[model samples]
Target: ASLTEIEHLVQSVCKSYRETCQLRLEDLLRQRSNIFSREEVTGYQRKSMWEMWERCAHHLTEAIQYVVEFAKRLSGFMELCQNDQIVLLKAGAMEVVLVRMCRAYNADNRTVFFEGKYGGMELFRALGCSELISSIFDFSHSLSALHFSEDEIALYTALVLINAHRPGLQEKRKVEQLQYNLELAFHHHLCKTHRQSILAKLPPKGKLRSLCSQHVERLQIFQHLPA
Candidate 1:
């Protein structure tokens, strides 16, 4: 009885998110088409840059917020200690950024989209964060192959936030246990929902995208850029 209700809730949440992800992706595609339709937008390169970029950063922020808020809805997320919340968010911030932008990503074209009509590898390159371009592409592609249901990916979200194994964890054992429970639940979900093929493939270190010092510095440069 207990498992049945939980399973239902899982399906409902995942289905709703899948729907939302698709809707947002379609909306972005429409916006991209509309932008190129306008002649002047293509003509005035510098002027369009200033205008589109301001909107671009703003839109990126909104997309980032979407998955953060989505994760917040996980049952215990809000009830966790404020310190835990901050630590989790700070640690796994980039994953949420990538996952939230899941909708804005165009796999066929290999481009990441901002909320509006903006899309290009050169944009991040100009900001000096060019390295993130391919990382986003590769990681996002990995996620697509997993073919996870909404609830399936939520487990990784749970593990990311509850990851107490980091060097400076505040509540080491408890945090790890919270993470442990999520892992178990995810395992159960995997066996029940479909095949268990991908479970073995998810590595401990795979939770976060690996980055070099140069890549890290580029992100800082983009973050500090004057808006």
Candidate 2:
């Protein structure tokens, strides 16, 4: 099945497991309370109730483990099942969700309970974001020829690479390259050859503009990084 279908299936399974665990826990608690009214319960009766409660608690723990394990597996599957470039682009788009989750998770002081609750939320958001960016990058790369101007292409490339965890040595060089390329594209009248060069380097398709726009939007979000 496709990733979309798999995502739905995973969600359903997780929900079912959670519901089942909740119901079982409730039942166990009710049964335990009922035993408290017994003026003189037989030894076996008390032992059975205790055993039931322990087993229910164990099952609850297992259900939680299943959710955590499945989430990790799904995240890996998304990365492995898709083309690298497509995954990268898709991830860029999803980065917004990741950032939001990160902010929320980090808002309170770190505690075991808070960590368990928000950490899972953060993980899922991050996985979704990475997958989307990767998909976009893959789609852009599949064009037969470059479709954006050189400056645009350079900026796009830099953004894609940086987002994909591949920032190379000399961060200034990449920044300078992107700035020079964009300037040349916008100032075509002053530098005709440079402008033409940039245009020729771009893809024949018009997606470069869209990609450039996305990069600009992402840059705005990341402008206050390390804050």
Candidate 3:
């Protein structure tokens, strides 16, 4: 019974993690698009550089908070399912993703702002590049380090790559790059440790899948899951 409970917990955690990643990706993409659109408007109505920076900072802070909290939750769950290899692998993958997101946000917050009179548009471009580069680096790390099955890695890598590419282009070669490297690191542990016993029962594939598919899911789940 205890083992069963643990399995269910593990599954729940994995689903939460996956959902978190998807939601976060969407959030980042949405914010990026919004920022860009704001950048393109008429001169008189455009947001000031400071305004843009403030918005970026706010989003980055929120993203970091989500990642950090999710990472902590996964780590706690790991303690519960110590021997479950599959569960641990998924949890680790999720952790890597969250960590990378946090790190990238942190980096962007530090480097993308202007100290003096740089134009608002230029600053926005710089911030966008920071986001893009961070996304690429985070994904690269995930690919190399996460213990993902080839199929999983391929899927994640493609997601990351798709995100990395500028939204509109003629060629549109969307590569698969996992969104979060910290999650990848968690998976790395699976390859190294090989424990394999933890398991969590999940709801059947539709809404549950969609829930897991979102990036904000982890944060929401964490709100209710046992510490």
Candidate 4:
């Protein structure tokens, strides 16, 4: 297929994956309020907190699973070995979770929708993660301000998944070449379309790499379920 054709396919994959993510996350995340009213003790607040944790966990697992499936659907993905596929998905899972969930995040209110409720900076802080919330807010805000379309967002997701370099990839050169091609596709599509986008300002590939840390692990805690 031509580049445009390939991109449309990619966009389709991104959309399906995103819609699946929303299905899992929307209701749990769609309500309101960011204030952490419940004090954390192994009592009722702890139970409520655990409820929030389990809610995020269930939604997060399904979201990552869709991403894993979506990666395989990308053009040229089947060219990589199973090991290659595994490495890429494992490495990039967190990035996909964060990038796609912009739908649930109300940037205007600076709040995150989750667990049939909303949690803003304060809720996150109350959950013992002021630092994580701050970093993620910065991350989410940068992603939001760029105003990427669903199709463009798919390219970014593909780039992130392909770009995650694992140490043991047997087909490292082939995978690296695929990453380069994806990067080129992303850059070309950006320049051709969103003329307003500033390459200098868009979320860098490095930011995706940096996001897979302690905090996201908590968010993705339920990912232990089979993918």
Model 4 C-alpha RMSD to native: 4.8
Please provide TM-scores, in order, for all candidate models, with all chains considered together.
0.69, 0.18, 0.31, 0.73
Top TM-score hit: 4
By summed lDDT, the worst window of 10 consecutive residues in model 1 runs over 35-44
Off by over 4 Å in 1: 1-56, 117-129, 201-204, 212-216, 221-227
Model 4 off-target regions past 4 Å?
Answer: 1-48, 116-118, 124-126, 216-227
The positional error of residue 34 in candidate 1, measured at the CA in angstroms, is 7.4
TM-score of 2: 0.18
Tell me which of candidates 1 and 4 scores higher on TM-score: 4
Model 3 ranges with Cα > 4 A deviation: 1-13, 22-46, 75-123, 126-227
For model 2, the local distance difference test gives 0.33
Model 3 CA lDDT for position 129: 39
lDDT of 2 by residue, 5-89 (tens): 4434434333433342222333322433222112222322344534533542454345434333322332122322234434333
Q: Can you give the lDDT of residue 39 in candidate 4?
A: 54
Worst 10 residues of 4 by lDDT: 35-44
| Per-residue C-alpha lDDT of model 1 across residues 27-119, encoded as one tens digit per residue | 666765533223433343334545645654665556546656655666556666667777776656555555555445556655555434555
